[PDB]
Amino acid sequence: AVKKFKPYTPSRRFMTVADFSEITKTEPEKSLVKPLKKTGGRNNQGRITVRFRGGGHKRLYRIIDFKRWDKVGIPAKVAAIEYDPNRSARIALLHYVDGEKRYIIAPDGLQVGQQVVAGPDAPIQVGNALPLRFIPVGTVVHAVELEPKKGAKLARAAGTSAQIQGREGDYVILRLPSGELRKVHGECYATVGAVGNADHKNIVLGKAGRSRWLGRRPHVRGAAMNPVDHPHGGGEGRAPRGRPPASPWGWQTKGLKTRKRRKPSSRFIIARR
Amino acid sequence: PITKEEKQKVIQEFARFPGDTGSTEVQVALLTLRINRLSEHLKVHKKDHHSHRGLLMMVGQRRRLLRYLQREDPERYRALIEKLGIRG
RNA sequence: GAGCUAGCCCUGGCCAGGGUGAAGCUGGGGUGAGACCCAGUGGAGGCCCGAACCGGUGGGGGAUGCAAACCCCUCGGAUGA
RNA sequence: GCAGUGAACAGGCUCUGGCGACUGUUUACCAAAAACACAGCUCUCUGCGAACUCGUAAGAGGAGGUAUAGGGAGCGACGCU
RNA sequence: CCUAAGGUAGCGAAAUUCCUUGUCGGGUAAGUUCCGACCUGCACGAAAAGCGUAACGACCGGAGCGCUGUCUCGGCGAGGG
RNA sequence: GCUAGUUGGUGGGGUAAUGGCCCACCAAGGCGACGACGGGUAGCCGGUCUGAGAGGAUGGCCGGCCACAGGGGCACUGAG
RNA sequence: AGCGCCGGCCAACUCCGUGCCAGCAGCCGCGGUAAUACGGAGGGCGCGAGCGUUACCCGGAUUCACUGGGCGUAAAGGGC
RNA sequence: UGGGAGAGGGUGGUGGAAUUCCCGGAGUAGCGGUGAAAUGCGCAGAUACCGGGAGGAACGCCGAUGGCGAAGGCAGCCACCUGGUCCACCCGUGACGCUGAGGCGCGAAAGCGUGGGGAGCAAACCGGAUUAGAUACCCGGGUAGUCCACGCCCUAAACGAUGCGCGCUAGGUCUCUGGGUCUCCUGGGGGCCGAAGCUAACGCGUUAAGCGCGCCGCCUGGGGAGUACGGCCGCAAGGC
RNA sequence: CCGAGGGUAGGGCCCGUGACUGGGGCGAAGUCGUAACAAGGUAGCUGUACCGGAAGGUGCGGCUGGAU
RNA sequence: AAUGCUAAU
Ligand SMILES: [K+]
Ligand SMILES: [K+]
Ligand SMILES: [K+]
Ligand SMILES: [K+]
Ligand SMILES: [K+]
Ligand SMILES: [Mg+2]
Ligand SMILES: [Mg+2]
Ligand SMILES: [Mg+2]
Ligand SMILES: [Mg+2]
Ligand SMILES: [Mg+2]
Ligand SMILES: [Mg+2]
Ligand SMILES: [Mg+2]
Ligand SMILES: [Mg+2]
Ligand SMILES: [Mg+2]
Ligand SMILES: [Mg+2]
Ligand SMILES: [Mg+2]
Ligand SMILES: [Mg+2]
Ligand SMILES: [Mg+2]
Ligand SMILES: [Mg+2]
Ligand SMILES: [Mg+2]
Ligand SMILES: [Mg+2]
Ligand SMILES: [Mg+2]
Ligand SMILES: [Mg+2]
Ligand SMILES: [Mg+2]
Ligand SMILES: [Mg+2]
Ligand SMILES: [Mg+2]
Ligand SMILES: [Mg+2]
Ligand SMILES: [Mg+2]
Ligand SMILES: [Mg+2]
Ligand SMILES: [Mg+2]
Ligand SMILES: [Mg+2]
Ligand SMILES: [Mg+2]
Ligand SMILES: [Mg+2]
Ligand SMILES: [Mg+2]
Ligand SMILES: [Mg+2]
Ligand SMILES: [Mg+2]
Ligand SMILES: [Mg+2]
Ligand SMILES: [Mg+2]
Ligand SMILES: [Mg+2]
Ligand SMILES: [Mg+2]
Ligand SMILES: [Mg+2]
Ligand SMILES: [Mg+2]
Ligand SMILES: [Mg+2]
Ligand SMILES: [Mg+2]
Ligand SMILES: [Mg+2]
Ligand SMILES: [Mg+2]
Ligand SMILES: [Mg+2]
Ligand SMILES: [Mg+2]
Ligand SMILES: [Mg+2]
Ligand SMILES: [Mg+2]
Ligand SMILES: [Mg+2]
Ligand SMILES: [Mg+2]
Ligand SMILES: [Mg+2]
Ligand SMILES: [Mg+2]
Ligand SMILES: [Mg+2]
Ligand SMILES: [Mg+2]
Ligand SMILES: [Mg+2]
Ligand SMILES: [Mg+2]
Ligand SMILES: [Mg+2]
Ligand SMILES: [Mg+2]
Ligand SMILES: [Mg+2]
Ligand SMILES: [Mg+2]
Ligand SMILES: [Mg+2]
Ligand SMILES: [Mg+2]
Ligand SMILES: [Mg+2]
Ligand SMILES: [Mg+2]
Ligand SMILES: [Mg+2]
Ligand SMILES: [Mg+2]
Ligand SMILES: [Mg+2]
Ligand SMILES: [Mg+2]
Ligand SMILES: [Mg+2]
Ligand SMILES: [Mg+2]
Ligand SMILES: [Mg+2]
Ligand SMILES: [Mg+2]
Ligand SMILES: [Mg+2]
Ligand SMILES: [Mg+2]
Ligand SMILES: [Mg+2]
Ligand SMILES: [Mg+2]
Ligand SMILES: [Mg+2]
Ligand SMILES: [Mg+2]
Ligand SMILES: [Mg+2]
Ligand SMILES: [Mg+2]
Ligand SMILES: [Mg+2]
Ligand SMILES: [Mg+2]
Ligand SMILES: [Mg+2]
Ligand SMILES: [Mg+2]
Ligand SMILES: [Mg+2]
Ligand SMILES: [Mg+2]
Ligand SMILES: [Mg+2]
Ligand SMILES: [Mg+2]
Ligand SMILES: [Mg+2]
Ligand SMILES: [Mg+2]
Ligand SMILES: [Mg+2]
Ligand SMILES: [Mg+2]
Ligand SMILES: [Mg+2]
Ligand SMILES: [Mg+2]
Ligand SMILES: [Mg+2]
Ligand SMILES: [Mg+2]
Ligand SMILES: [Mg+2]
Ligand SMILES: [Mg+2]
Ligand SMILES: [Mg+2]
Ligand SMILES: [Mg+2]
Ligand SMILES: [Mg+2]
Ligand SMILES: [Mg+2]
Ligand SMILES: [Mg+2]
Ligand SMILES: [Mg+2]
Ligand SMILES: [Mg+2]
Ligand SMILES: [Mg+2]
Ligand SMILES: [Mg+2]
Ligand SMILES: [Mg+2]
Ligand SMILES: [Mg+2]
Ligand SMILES: [Mg+2]
Ligand SMILES: [Mg+2]
Ligand SMILES: [Mg+2]
Ligand SMILES: [Mg+2]
Ligand SMILES: [Mg+2]
Ligand SMILES: [Mg+2]
Ligand SMILES: [Mg+2]
Ligand SMILES: [Mg+2]
Ligand SMILES: [Mg+2]
Ligand SMILES: [Mg+2]
Ligand SMILES: [Mg+2]
Ligand SMILES: [Mg+2]
Ligand SMILES: [Mg+2]
Ligand SMILES: [Mg+2]
Ligand SMILES: [Mg+2]
Ligand SMILES: [Mg+2]
Ligand SMILES: [Mg+2]
Ligand SMILES: [Mg+2]
Ligand SMILES: [Mg+2]
Ligand SMILES: [Mg+2]
Ligand SMILES: [Mg+2]
Ligand SMILES: [Mg+2]
Ligand SMILES: [Mg+2]
Ligand SMILES: [Mg+2]
Ligand SMILES: [Mg+2]
Ligand SMILES: [Mg+2]
Ligand SMILES: [Mg+2]
Ligand SMILES: [Mg+2]
Ligand SMILES: [Mg+2]
Ligand SMILES: [Mg+2]
Ligand SMILES: [Mg+2]
Ligand SMILES: [Mg+2]
Ligand SMILES: [Mg+2]
Ligand SMILES: [Mg+2]
Ligand SMILES: [Mg+2]
Ligand SMILES: [Mg+2]
Ligand SMILES: [Mg+2]
Ligand SMILES: [Mg+2]
Ligand SMILES: [Mg+2]
Ligand SMILES: [Mg+2]
Ligand SMILES: [Mg+2]
Ligand SMILES: [Mg+2]
Ligand SMILES: [Mg+2]
Ligand SMILES: [Mg+2]
Ligand SMILES: [Mg+2]
Ligand SMILES: [Mg+2]
Ligand SMILES: [Mg+2]
Ligand SMILES: [Mg+2]
Ligand SMILES: [Mg+2]
Ligand SMILES: [Mg+2]
Ligand SMILES: [Mg+2]
Ligand SMILES: [Mg+2]
Ligand SMILES: [Mg+2]
Ligand SMILES: [Mg+2]
Ligand SMILES: [Mg+2]
Ligand SMILES: [Mg+2]
Ligand SMILES: [Mg+2]
Ligand SMILES: [Mg+2]
Ligand SMILES: [Mg+2]
Ligand SMILES: [Mg+2]
Ligand SMILES: [Mg+2]
Ligand SMILES: [Mg+2]
Ligand SMILES: [Mg+2]
Ligand SMILES: [Mg+2]
Ligand SMILES: [Mg+2]
Ligand SMILES: [Mg+2]
Ligand SMILES: [Mg+2]
Ligand SMILES: [Mg+2]
Ligand SMILES: [Mg+2]
Ligand SMILES: [Mg+2]
Ligand SMILES: [Mg+2]
Ligand SMILES: [Mg+2]
Ligand SMILES: [Mg+2]
Ligand SMILES: [Mg+2]
Ligand SMILES: [Mg+2]
Ligand SMILES: [Mg+2]
Ligand SMILES: [Mg+2]
Ligand SMILES: [Mg+2]
Ligand SMILES: [Mg+2]
Ligand SMILES: [Mg+2]
Ligand SMILES: [Mg+2]
Ligand SMILES: [Mg+2]
Ligand SMILES: [Mg+2]
Ligand SMILES: [Mg+2]
Ligand SMILES: [Mg+2]
Ligand SMILES: [Mg+2]
Ligand SMILES: [Mg+2]
Ligand SMILES: [Mg+2]
Ligand SMILES: [Mg+2]
Ligand SMILES: [Mg+2]
Ligand SMILES: [Mg+2]
Ligand SMILES: [Mg+2]
Ligand SMILES: [Mg+2]
Ligand SMILES: [Mg+2]
Ligand SMILES: [Mg+2]
Ligand SMILES: [Mg+2]
Ligand SMILES: [Mg+2]
Ligand SMILES: [Mg+2]
Ligand SMILES: [Mg+2]
Ligand SMILES: [Mg+2]
Ligand SMILES: [Mg+2]
Ligand SMILES: [Mg+2]
Ligand SMILES: [Mg+2]
Ligand SMILES: [Mg+2]
Ligand SMILES: [Mg+2]
Ligand SMILES: [Mg+2]
Ligand SMILES: [Mg+2]
Ligand SMILES: [Mg+2]
Ligand SMILES: [Mg+2]
Ligand SMILES: [Mg+2]
Ligand SMILES: [Mg+2]
Ligand SMILES: [Mg+2]
Ligand SMILES: [Mg+2]
Ligand SMILES: [Mg+2]
Ligand SMILES: [Mg+2]
Ligand SMILES: [Mg+2]
Ligand SMILES: [Mg+2]
Ligand SMILES: [Mg+2]
Ligand SMILES: [Mg+2]
Ligand SMILES: [Mg+2]
Ligand SMILES: [Mg+2]
Ligand SMILES: [Mg+2]
Ligand SMILES: [Mg+2]
Ligand SMILES: [Mg+2]
Ligand SMILES: [Mg+2]
Ligand SMILES: [Mg+2]
Ligand SMILES: [Mg+2]
Ligand SMILES: [Mg+2]
Ligand SMILES: [Mg+2]
Ligand SMILES: [Mg+2]
Ligand SMILES: [Mg+2]
Ligand SMILES: [Mg+2]
Ligand SMILES: [Mg+2]
Ligand SMILES: [Mg+2]
Ligand SMILES: [Mg+2]
Ligand SMILES: [Mg+2]
Ligand SMILES: [Mg+2]
Ligand SMILES: [Mg+2]
Ligand SMILES: [Mg+2]
Ligand SMILES: [Mg+2]
Ligand SMILES: [Mg+2]
Ligand SMILES: [Mg+2]
Ligand SMILES: [Mg+2]
Ligand SMILES: [Mg+2]
Ligand SMILES: [Mg+2]
Ligand SMILES: [Mg+2]
Ligand SMILES: [Mg+2]
Ligand SMILES: [Mg+2]
Ligand SMILES: [Mg+2]
Ligand SMILES: [Mg+2]
Ligand SMILES: [Mg+2]
Ligand SMILES: [Mg+2]
Ligand SMILES: [Mg+2]
Ligand SMILES: [Mg+2]
Ligand SMILES: [Mg+2]
Ligand SMILES: [Mg+2]
Ligand SMILES: [Mg+2]
Ligand SMILES: [Mg+2]
Ligand SMILES: [Mg+2]
Ligand SMILES: [Mg+2]
Ligand SMILES: [Mg+2]
Ligand SMILES: [Mg+2]
Ligand SMILES: [Mg+2]
Ligand SMILES: [Mg+2]
Ligand SMILES: [Mg+2]
Ligand SMILES: [Mg+2]
Ligand SMILES: [Mg+2]
Ligand SMILES: [Mg+2]
Ligand SMILES: [Mg+2]
Ligand SMILES: [Mg+2]
Ligand SMILES: [Mg+2]
Ligand SMILES: [Mg+2]
Ligand SMILES: [Mg+2]
Ligand SMILES: [Mg+2]
Ligand SMILES: [Mg+2]
Ligand SMILES: [Mg+2]
Ligand SMILES: [Mg+2]
Ligand SMILES: [Mg+2]
Ligand SMILES: [Mg+2]
Ligand SMILES: [Mg+2]
Ligand SMILES: [Mg+2]
Ligand SMILES: [Mg+2]
Ligand SMILES: [Mg+2]
Ligand SMILES: [Mg+2]
Ligand SMILES: [Mg+2]
Ligand SMILES: [Mg+2]
Ligand SMILES: [Mg+2]
Ligand SMILES: [Mg+2]
Ligand SMILES: [Mg+2]
Ligand SMILES: [Mg+2]
Ligand SMILES: [Mg+2]
Ligand SMILES: [Mg+2]
Ligand SMILES: [Mg+2]
Ligand SMILES: [Mg+2]
Ligand SMILES: [Mg+2]
Ligand SMILES: [Mg+2]
Ligand SMILES: [Mg+2]
Ligand SMILES: [Mg+2]
Ligand SMILES: [Mg+2]
Ligand SMILES: [Mg+2]
Ligand SMILES: [Mg+2]
Ligand SMILES: [Mg+2]
Ligand SMILES: [Mg+2]
Ligand SMILES: [Mg+2]
Ligand SMILES: [Mg+2]
Ligand SMILES: [Mg+2]
Ligand SMILES: [Mg+2]
Ligand SMILES: [Mg+2]
Ligand SMILES: [Mg+2]
Ligand SMILES: [Mg+2]
Ligand SMILES: [Mg+2]
Ligand SMILES: [Mg+2]
Ligand SMILES: [Mg+2]
Ligand SMILES: [Mg+2]
């Protein structure tokens, strides 16, 4: 339900914004926020290592619980759905019967007032977290660990999900958000349901300034540069590429594969994306 | 569906005399019950056009009955629409 | 050597006055119910006019200069990248 | 009274082509533009100790992000293609 | 006859046309520029995108009106030298 | 879709006389698919021609009414 | 004493000349070497101080059908 | 009030047959295709066979001159929500009716927009044949599209080329579905043959194109032309 | 004050005309093919979409005003 | 599997 605007300015003609109607609380929980260090794409040497970054809105980091086997068997009540500036998905504030408060990625269909629980004996309901081997084949899951007790790594962006395809010994075959079929250890944890905020990809930024609000600085084409700066630089007037298209550092950028050939995890990938 | 109990309750509610089942008031009340239930159904089943034609037929029949009642007894007509909340 | 200049990071400050009138909301209309329509309210925007401020368009002057880039008239932006 | 924003401050207008959609940015000191950027479109890489960048390395950035994400390339609102 | 295949839609004397001030129409008393067409495209053409496009531009063309020491064509006066 | 003296009211001016005819003020009305408004065409009738009738066409001459007097506007005199 | 007509509609026919030419024509159509259809002649028919032609109106036209038409396949039933 | 039949509509599930693809097994000299071939596929191991898995789309027999719907249309099975319609009882109201210029809603296929999906088929496109040529018919491939959600488009041989309502005018025969006094009679649908009548004829004929009444739409020689202009609608194609 | 008329500016509608460009009707003869009428030699027609010198072809659905 | 036949009874 993306919100549109009448064209009372040139930029408002196309710009769309998120509805925000699912958000119930407008201030983050004080005990679960930490200051976030803006880098501008610089490393500890002070050098730009990722180009065209910096200058966005100030942000606070919210601590997300990505290892839900920490509190197996202790139910929690969903207190609120909140805005999180650091990720595309919304977050959910959990009020454990323990009196402990934690944030999780808010799944699609989670409501304030429901009960969630983690553990091998949890019901198969949206928001519950279980080891993969206890979850039926065909279930849609998100926030999936890659290796046991190492933290959720897969299917965390808004609207993404993974689906269990089958079992093989100690391993469970998963279809990843990218379409890749992968074997994941059956003792890895996952949460039932898909990530919410599936409309996030329908947002139209509308103007250059909105990209700047998000910390994305302007991108300069290689063909706009001089030969000293880029393989595509130079030429009198506009020029075609004049060679296979390349990065600023020389490698070809249309089809050249870059995954390391002899990587150990290749034994656990059944079909590439 | 509409069971016999609620229909009989409506019939007793709106009938003039105890043995009456086909007066204008009772017919209007039964039509209003059916129209309310069908409109509630159509609020969820939007693509149910075939049922919507029947709803249009019911609305037209009730309009004809109300016109006749208003033309033959304005006091009865006003009392009936006030009791049913028809106007709009 | 980044006390000039380019980018970024932390923490502060500044932007006279006037105009336009989005959404939302309220009331009326409309209908089987609606979608919609009208008025009022409302105060949105890399919105408008214009000083500070930031620029530097056209012309004239300056040319062993007031000045190793200035002066005068004119001109762009001015709640935002 | 010749004359009433009586002094000062305060758009000349219209018609019709090219280029760029638009607000912006740029050769400090001869070029402000049709150049750059831009929302948007497409291709391609990347399953996470991710690809990629800096570094001899340790270690950083990427990101306390996880394919609705991140990098690279070309095109550059929108309409018809 | 030759080729891997022989330029499709659209556009065209063009920010692209050498002959060239092509030719025809318009605008002017008179128009190498301008606008509308034709196609003989030296040497347009589909994301180094093709053809359009309201709004926007200290961008670059062409025309008219208003008004003027720009000019016919110069004259006088003021202040600083 | 049309209308702002427009539609109505009050008071007045003017006329032989009613009247928004004209003026000042008050209200927001008036007209329209039964065709308003706009465009085109046209002097109208008794009659005439045609036709089995119904109808169609037409309005020269003659009798009646209206309009006009180089193209527009205006008043004076007067019963007019 | 003249004018029109003489293939059918429509009343009134033969000869010569020409040869898809010249020409006629309201419609259908005539004329390309034996033309009652073109031109002339003889004859005939209709009107006659007239006879033809053009223009316009009604009729025939029940072909806007009130009197007095239609819509399966001829024009015509609206997608429901 | 009591009952009936039905691919009428919407939503959620789930059954097997078959095609395709992948994995494994076994196995070898061609398969496929046509009028005849060739392109193509195949020793880098195809075709034919067996086992396992995935996915999409459509529902064989029943099945019909059958049924339902206002039309367009509707077909595996199950559940839920919902429309219409028929019969019996003769209970209630008391003319409350018919038609309908505009308006509103629905409306095959193709087409358009944004997401998803994609087995098979298949406009455009590529190649092989055929042929004088072959921008086709035949063959091998192949993208939109065909499917789903939402939103547009609004057309057709949208046909019974037959507007709707009501009454009256021999019958015979087949069939679906009710009630009864279940030989048979009495309702409601769908077909065939035929009285009278009608029609230019073909044909129609109680499901009228007969005899009548009411209301609506449409026609006035063929072409130009469903064109142009104007107006309204649509993102476009284009529609009225 | 009103006021015939004249002037200035901006609109609405209509008529004539225009380089060029699009189709239409016609023709006792031309060029290219042969789409329809017979099962017209691929049944025809039709709405829509894409394509092709041209008539037309193909896809999806529909009708019989076709056959079996 | 096979295209065509102007123009005066
Ligand atoms: K760029
Ligand atoms: K408002
Ligand atoms: K200009
Ligand atoms: K040219
Ligand atoms: K050129
Ligand atoms: Mg918007
Ligand atoms: Mg708005
Ligand atoms: Mg708007
Ligand atoms: Mg705007
Ligand atoms: Mg704009
Ligand atoms: Mg803007
Ligand atoms: Mg913008
Ligand atoms: Mg806050
Ligand atoms: Mg804090
Ligand atoms: Mg350092
Ligand atoms: Mg250093
Ligand atoms: Mg980088
Ligand atoms: Mg950076
Ligand atoms: Mg920045
Ligand atoms: Mg930021
Ligand atoms: Mg900030
Ligand atoms: Mg968030
Ligand atoms: Mg994210
Ligand atoms: Mg930000
Ligand atoms: Mg960036
Ligand atoms: Mg970025
Ligand atoms: Mg920057
Ligand atoms: Mg940026
Ligand atoms: Mg780039
Ligand atoms: Mg360059
Ligand atoms: Mg450069
Ligand atoms: Mg180098
Ligand atoms: Mg280099
Ligand atoms: Mg280069
Ligand atoms: Mg070059
Ligand atoms: Mg260059
Ligand atoms: Mg250079
Ligand atoms: Mg150059
Ligand atoms: Mg250059
Ligand atoms: Mg060049
Ligand atoms: Mg350059
Ligand atoms: Mg170029
Ligand atoms: Mg270049
Ligand atoms: Mg070059
Ligand atoms: Mg390049
Ligand atoms: Mg090159
Ligand atoms: Mg290269
Ligand atoms: Mg490359
Ligand atoms: Mg990797
Ligand atoms: Mg330094
Ligand atoms: Mg510095
Ligand atoms: Mg600095
Ligand atoms: Mg400093
Ligand atoms: Mg700086
Ligand atoms: Mg900065
Ligand atoms: Mg900073
Ligand atoms: Mg800071
Ligand atoms: Mg600060
Ligand atoms: Mg700060
Ligand atoms: Mg600061
Ligand atoms: Mg302050
Ligand atoms: Mg300011
Ligand atoms: Mg200010
Ligand atoms: Mg202010
Ligand atoms: Mg201000
Ligand atoms: Mg303003
Ligand atoms: Mg203001
Ligand atoms: Mg205002
Ligand atoms: Mg404001
Ligand atoms: Mg502004
Ligand atoms: Mg402004
Ligand atoms: Mg302005
Ligand atoms: Mg401005
Ligand atoms: Mg401005
Ligand atoms: Mg200033
Ligand atoms: Mg300043
Ligand atoms: Mg500055
Ligand atoms: Mg300054
Ligand atoms: Mg300044
Ligand atoms: Mg600068
Ligand atoms: Mg300047
Ligand atoms: Mg000057
Ligand atoms: Mg100047
Ligand atoms: Mg100067
Ligand atoms: Mg000066
Ligand atoms: Mg100068
Ligand atoms: Mg000088
Ligand atoms: Mg100077
Ligand atoms: Mg200097
Ligand atoms: Mg200065
Ligand atoms: Mg100044
Ligand atoms: Mg200024
Ligand atoms: Mg300004
Ligand atoms: Mg500025
Ligand atoms: Mg600026
Ligand atoms: Mg501005
Ligand atoms: Mg500013
Ligand atoms: Mg300011
Ligand atoms: Mg300003
Ligand atoms: Mg401002
Ligand atoms: Mg601010
Ligand atoms: Mg502002
Ligand atoms: Mg800002
Ligand atoms: Mg005075
Ligand atoms: Mg004077
Ligand atoms: Mg004066
Ligand atoms: Mg005055
Ligand atoms: Mg002044
Ligand atoms: Mg003044
Ligand atoms: Mg003054
Ligand atoms: Mg002053
Ligand atoms: Mg000004
Ligand atoms: Mg200004
Ligand atoms: Mg002026
Ligand atoms: Mg101008
Ligand atoms: Mg011009
Ligand atoms: Mg031009
Ligand atoms: Mg311009
Ligand atoms: Mg030019
Ligand atoms: Mg261009
Ligand atoms: Mg620009
Ligand atoms: Mg530019
Ligand atoms: Mg533009
Ligand atoms: Mg543009
Ligand atoms: Mg742009
Ligand atoms: Mg553009
Ligand atoms: Mg741009
Ligand atoms: Mg453009
Ligand atoms: Mg702007
Ligand atoms: Mg600005
Ligand atoms: Mg601006
Ligand atoms: Mg600017
Ligand atoms: Mg600019
Ligand atoms: Mg700048
Ligand atoms: Mg700047
Ligand atoms: Mg800068
Ligand atoms: Mg720049
Ligand atoms: Mg320089
Ligand atoms: Mg400079
Ligand atoms: Mg500069
Ligand atoms: Mg600098
Ligand atoms: Mg320098
Ligand atoms: Mg300069
Ligand atoms: Mg410059
Ligand atoms: Mg500038
Ligand atoms: Mg600028
Ligand atoms: Mg400059
Ligand atoms: Mg500029
Ligand atoms: Mg550029
Ligand atoms: Mg630049
Ligand atoms: Mg934009
Ligand atoms: Mg956009
Ligand atoms: Mg675009
Ligand atoms: Mg992309
Ligand atoms: Mg990418
Ligand atoms: Mg990569
Ligand atoms: Mg990189
Ligand atoms: Mg290392
Ligand atoms: Mg690192
Ligand atoms: Mg970091
Ligand atoms: Mg890191
Ligand atoms: Mg990326
Ligand atoms: Mg990218
Ligand atoms: Mg590209
Ligand atoms: Mg490329
Ligand atoms: Mg650019
Ligand atoms: Mg573009
Ligand atoms: Mg570019
Ligand atoms: Mg072309
Ligand atoms: Mg061009
Ligand atoms: Mg062009
Ligand atoms: Mg030229
Ligand atoms: Mg020329
Ligand atoms: Mg051009
Ligand atoms: Mg030239
Ligand atoms: Mg030259
Ligand atoms: Mg010349
Ligand atoms: Mg010239
Ligand atoms: Mg010329
Ligand atoms: Mg000429
Ligand atoms: Mg001229
Ligand atoms: Mg001129
Ligand atoms: Mg002239
Ligand atoms: Mg002239
Ligand atoms: Mg002239
Ligand atoms: Mg001349
Ligand atoms: Mg000329
Ligand atoms: Mg010039
Ligand atoms: Mg010039
Ligand atoms: Mg010129
Ligand atoms: Mg020119
Ligand atoms: Mg030109
Ligand atoms: Mg020109
Ligand atoms: Mg020419
Ligand atoms: Mg042309
Ligand atoms: Mg040429
Ligand atoms: Mg071009
Ligand atoms: Mg291309
Ligand atoms: Mg290129
Ligand atoms: Mg290219
Ligand atoms: Mg471009
Ligand atoms: Mg263009
Ligand atoms: Mg352009
Ligand atoms: Mg436009
Ligand atoms: Mg605009
Ligand atoms: Mg524009
Ligand atoms: Mg414009
Ligand atoms: Mg504007
Ligand atoms: Mg503009
Ligand atoms: Mg403006
Ligand atoms: Mg501007
Ligand atoms: Mg402009
Ligand atoms: Mg500009
Ligand atoms: Mg300038
Ligand atoms: Mg300038
Ligand atoms: Mg500029
Ligand atoms: Mg200039
Ligand atoms: Mg120009
Ligand atoms: Mg200009
Ligand atoms: Mg000029
Ligand atoms: Mg002039
Ligand atoms: Mg002038
Ligand atoms: Mg002088
Ligand atoms: Mg002078
Ligand atoms: Mg002067
Ligand atoms: Mg002069
Ligand atoms: Mg001179
Ligand atoms: Mg001189
Ligand atoms: Mg001179
Ligand atoms: Mg002189
Ligand atoms: Mg002088
Ligand atoms: Mg002198
Ligand atoms: Mg002088
Ligand atoms: Mg003097
Ligand atoms: Mg002098
Ligand atoms: Mg002097
Ligand atoms: Mg002197
Ligand atoms: Mg002085
Ligand atoms: Mg002196
Ligand atoms: Mg002196
Ligand atoms: Mg008055
Ligand atoms: Mg009056
Ligand atoms: Mg009145
Ligand atoms: Mg009479
Ligand atoms: Mg008589
Ligand atoms: Mg009579
Ligand atoms: Mg008369
Ligand atoms: Mg008269
Ligand atoms: Mg007169
Ligand atoms: Mg006279
Ligand atoms: Mg007298
Ligand atoms: Mg008198
Ligand atoms: Mg005879
Ligand atoms: Mg003859
Ligand atoms: Mg004769
Ligand atoms: Mg003879
Ligand atoms: Mg004769
Ligand atoms: Mg003779
Ligand atoms: Mg008679
Ligand atoms: Mg007759
Ligand atoms: Mg008659
Ligand atoms: Mg008759
Ligand atoms: Mg009649
Ligand atoms: Mg008839
Ligand atoms: Mg018929
Ligand atoms: Mg008939
Ligand atoms: Mg026919
Ligand atoms: Mg007819
Ligand atoms: Mg017919
Ligand atoms: Mg029908
Ligand atoms: Mg029809
Ligand atoms: Mg239908
Ligand atoms: Mg082989
Ligand atoms: Mg095998
Ligand atoms: Mg599949
Ligand atoms: Mg149906
Ligand atoms: Mg029904
Ligand atoms: Mg009874
Ligand atoms: Mg009674
Ligand atoms: Mg009736
Ligand atoms: Mg009516
Ligand atoms: Mg449809
Ligand atoms: Mg169909
Ligand atoms: Mg479809
Ligand atoms: Mg589609
Ligand atoms: Mg072929
Ligand atoms: Mg051959
Ligand atoms: Mg095929
Ligand atoms: Mg196939
Ligand atoms: Mg495909
Ligand atoms: Mg039908
Ligand atoms: Mg019909
Ligand atoms: Mg009929
Ligand atoms: Mg009807
Ligand atoms: Mg029967
Ligand atoms: Mg029967
Ligand atoms: Mg029969
Ligand atoms: Mg029969
Ligand atoms: Mg029968
Ligand atoms: Mg008949
Ligand atoms: Mg007729
Ligand atoms: Mg049309
Ligand atoms: Mg039109
Ligand atoms: Mg539109
Ligand atoms: Mg049409
Ligand atoms: Mg004309
Ligand atoms: Mg055919
Ligand atoms: Mg044939
Ligand atoms: Mg044929
Ligand atoms: Mg033949
Ligand atoms: Mg054939
Ligand atoms: Mg055939
Ligand atoms: Mg054929
Ligand atoms: Mg046939
Ligand atoms: Mg056939
Ligand atoms: Mg077809
Ligand atoms: Mg298409
Ligand atoms: Mg084809
Ligand atoms: Mg033949
Ligand atoms: Mg033949
Ligand atoms: Mg031939
Ligand atoms: Mg033959
Ligand atoms: Mg023959
Ligand atoms: Mg023949
Ligand atoms: Mg023959």
Residue A120: count other Cβ atoms within 10 Å of its Cβ: 13
Give distance CA A240 / C1' D76 (Å): 16
CA distance A162 to B75: 67
- Quote the longest CA-to-CA distance of chain B: 42
Measured in whole angstroms, how far is the alpha carbon of residue A83 from the centre of its chain?
14
Q: What are phi and psi of A239, to 5 degrees?
A: -135, 150
Give distance CA B31 / C1' F46 (Å): 68
- Whether the CB-CB separation of A40 and A217 falls below 8 Å is answered with no
Q: Closest Cα partner for B58 from B88, B30, B86?
A: B30
Task: Tell me chain B's radius of gyration from C-alpha atoms.
Answer: 14
Note the resolution in Å, 1 decimal.
2.1
Q: Which nucleotides of D are covered by protein (CB under 7 A)?
A: 21-23, 35-40, 43-55, 59-62, 64-78
- Burial label for A27, CB within 10 Å (0-12, 13-18, 19+), is exposed
Tell how far the Cα of B64 is from the centroid of ligand 210, in angstroms. Answer: 57
Tell how far the Cα of A192 is from the centroid of ligand 114, in angstroms. Answer: 74
Is the CB atom of residue B52 positioned under 7 angstroms from any atom of strand C?
yes
Tell how far the Cα of A237 is from the centroid of ligand 178, in angstroms. Answer: 29
- Whether the CB-CB separation of B58 and B41 falls below 8 Å is answered with no
Residues 6+ apart with CB under 8 A from A215: A38, A53, A54, A55, A56, A57
User: Is the four-CA dihedral A89, A92, A93, A96 of positive or negative sign?
Assistant: negative
Give distance CA B54 / C1' C29 (Å): 28
- A271-to-A146, A155, A176, A178 alpha-carbon distances in Å: 17, 18, 11, 11
Tokens read off for B9? 């309750």
Nearest nt (C1') to A15 (CA)? D39
Q: Closest Cα partner for A270 from A190, A179, A194, A188?
A: A179
CA distance A115 to A176: 27
| Coil/strand/helix, residue A76 | strand
Q: What is the DSSP letter of A165?
A: E
Tell how far the Cα of A7 is from the centroid of ligand 303, in angstroms. Answer: 29
Q: What is the DSSP letter of B65?
A: H
Residue A191: count other Cβ atoms within 10 Å of its Cβ: 26
Task: Tell me chain A's radius of gyration from C-alpha atoms.
Answer: 22
CA distance A148 to A9: 52
Q: Closest Cα partner for A196 from A71, A36, A34, A19?
A: A19
CA distance B54 to B51: 5
CA distance A127 to A108: 9
- Burial label for A234, CB within 10 Å (0-12, 13-18, 19+), is middle
Q: What is the DSSP letter of A73?
A: T
* Technique that determined the structure: cryo-EM
Q: Which single residue has its CA nearest the C1' atom of nucleotide C46?
A: A209
Strand stretches in chain A, DSSP E: 33-35, 60-62, 76-82, 91-96, 101-105, 115-116, 129-131, 140-142, 144-145, 152-154, 162-168, 171-175, 181-185, 189-192, 269-271
Tell how far the Cα of A185 is from the centroid of ligand 298, in angstroms. Answer: 81
Measured in whole angstroms, how far is the alpha carbon of residue A27 from the centre of its chain?
22
DSSP A80-141: EEE--TTSSS-EEEEEETTS-EEEEEPBTT--TT-EE-BSTT--S-TT-EEEGGGSPTT-EE
Is the CB atom of residue A239 positioned under 7 angstroms from any atom of strand E?
yes
Find the helix or strand (DSSP H, E) in which A2 lies.
Answer: none
Domains and their CATH numbers in chain B:
1-87 (1.10.287.10)
- Whether the CB-CB separation of A209 and A57 falls below 8 Å is answered with no
CA distance A146 to A155: 11
Q: Which of residues 4-33 of B touch strand C (CB under 7 A)?
A: none
- A218-to-A90, B41, B88 alpha-carbon distances in Å: 27, 53, 58
- Whether the CB-CB separation of B62 and B32 falls below 8 Å is answered with yes
User: Is the four-CA dihedral A123, A125, A130, A136 of positive or negative sign?
Assistant: positive
